[PDB]
Design an enzyme around this catalytic site. Structure first.
Site: not given
Ligand SMILES: COc1ccc2cc(-c3nn(C(C)C)c4ncnc(N)c34)ccc2c1
Length: 453
Positions: A130, A132, A135, A151, A170
């Protein structure tokens, strides 16, 4: 081990795939973390427990500068807690639109990083699927900051939402073979190919008026370099894109082989600025973000309707002698009751309650009129969602005209996958002078009517 014993919530970073992400802090060490919280009720597991645990354990041991670092994993009755490194630089495309210039050198540097992270994950038999632009986070607010891919591995273990608010954007990036069911790590190269195409032209290679039209284009797999913007682009870049967007995955270039591509090797060591591309990207991004904001606004409004009536019913039951007066401890217990069915534990609910009370200038220490508390508590998230929608509106309206055209609405509602007949119908109810355009208030009114109000 219990998640809330160790970590406290600071604030919500945003919504991502599979769940909300909360900026949390370790209660002892003070370490800040980004915690993806996955609701078991809302998100189904594709794999078994043993497979998820083992994957998580692998991920904890993996380390690469272009991959989000995973630290910890927790599980309770209702949720999975994924604790990762927090990045502060925001989404790649949001940074890119802020630049005055952008070249193949910049694009190549971006894509090398993505390919490097992908290559590493593939060596470890972890697939994204996924991939994009959203991500791709930037590590810090520094202009040179590294890209961190988020992700990886999740789509193998969790089923994606079928709700359009979760599905925005997506369709452009998904590999054809993912649609048909037989896929492998090569799907990530396809997605990266789509991203590169967008980086260099500002337009998706596979485009359409709605999700299904886009998917139809993807599945046929045909694209062209016949736009005016592609004249500015080198042959090597188009050759790489061709190899990444090769239909049969076994014929498609690998991530590792892509890193050795002439384009990557040449441009990551004079070049003009891709100004047409930057402009197109700005428009692309603004449109995507407005569509997203539109769906989230409608969703938040529906959630508000649900929660307002639930909270009212909870407090009525609690109010034994029925005079509409409850104390703060009771308001907390009922707010907890609502959460029982962001607010990760009791202390989070106490604070939130206290914030509402302090808004309404109600005394914390006496008995309170619960009907007023309910209104403010909900009204808060209402005012809030409206503010994010408005900002997205203003951002999209780059000429500061204060209006969005009917043609633009078509584009927005298309991406949001709102039925063409339906929005036109609501547009007709709001736009009654055949103006063929709407201001913010009017746009908001349309969305309210598009979510049963
Ligand atoms: C597979 O285990 C994990 C653990 C934490 C995660 C954190 C983020 C994340 N999102 N966002 C905003 C864009 C909503 C973040 N902003 C800053 N840092 C981040 N780390 C994230 C995304 C995926 C993740 C997957």
């Amino acid at each position: 081990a219990i998640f809330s014993d160790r970590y406290k919530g600071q604030r919500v970073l945003g919504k991502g795939s599979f769940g909300e992400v909360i900026l949390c802090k370790d209660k002892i060490t003070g370490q800040e973390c980004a915690v993806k919280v996955i609701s078991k009720r809302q998100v189904k597991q594709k794999t078994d427990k043993e497979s998820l645990l083992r994957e998580v354990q692998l991920l904890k041991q993996l380390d690469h500068p272009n991959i989000m670092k995973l630290y910890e994993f927790f599980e309770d009755k209702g949720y999975f807690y994924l604790v990762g490194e927090v990045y502060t630089g925001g989404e790649l495309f949001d940074e890119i639109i802020s630049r005055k210039r952008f070249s193949e050198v910049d694009a190549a540097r971006i894509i090398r990083q993505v390919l490097s992270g992908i290559t590493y994950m593939h060596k470890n038999k972890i697939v994204h699927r996924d991939l994009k632009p959203e991500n791709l986070l930037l590590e810090s607010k520094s202009k040179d900051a590294n890209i961190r891919i988020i992700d990886f591995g999740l789509s193998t273990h969790f089923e994606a939402s079928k709700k359009m608010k979760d599905k925005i954007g997506t369709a452009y990036y998904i590999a054809p073979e993912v649609l048909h069911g037989t896929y492998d790590e090569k799907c990530d190269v396809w997605s990266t190919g789509v991203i590169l195409y967008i980086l260099l032209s500002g337009c998706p290679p596979f485009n359409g008026a709605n999700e299904y039209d886009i998917l139809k284009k993807v599945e046929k797999g045909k694209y062209t370099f016949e736009l005016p913007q592609w004249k500015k682009v080198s042959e090597s870049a188009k050759d790489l894109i061709r190899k990444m967007l090769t239909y049969v995955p076994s014929m498609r270039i690998s991530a590792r082989d892509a890193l050795d591509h002439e384009w990557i090797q040449t441009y990551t060591k004079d070049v003009p600025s891709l100004d047409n591309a930057i402009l197109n990207i700005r428009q692309f991004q603004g449109t995507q973000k407005l569509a997203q904001a539109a769906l989230l606004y409608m969703g938040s409004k529906l959630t508000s309707q649900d929660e307002t009536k639930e909270l009212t019913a909870i407090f009525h039951k609690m109010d034994k002698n029925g005079d509409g007066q409850l104390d703060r401890a009771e308001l907390i217990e009922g707010y907890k009751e609502l959460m029982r069915m962001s607010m990760l534990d009791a202390s989070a609910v106490e604070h939130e309650v206290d914030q509402v009370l302090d808004a309404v200038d109600f005394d914390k220490n006496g008995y309170i009129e619960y009907s007023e508390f309910v209104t403010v508590a909900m009204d808060r998230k209402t005012l809030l969602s409206r503010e994010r929608l408005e900002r997205a509106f203003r951002m999209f309206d780059s000429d500061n005209s204060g209006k969005i055209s009917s043609t633009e609405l078509a584009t927005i509602f298309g991406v949001s996958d709102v039925d063409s007949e339906t929005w036109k119908s609501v547009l007709s109810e709001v736009d009654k002078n055949n103006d063929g355009e709407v201001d913010f208030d009017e746009f908001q009114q349309m969305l309210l009517k598009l979510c049963g109000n």
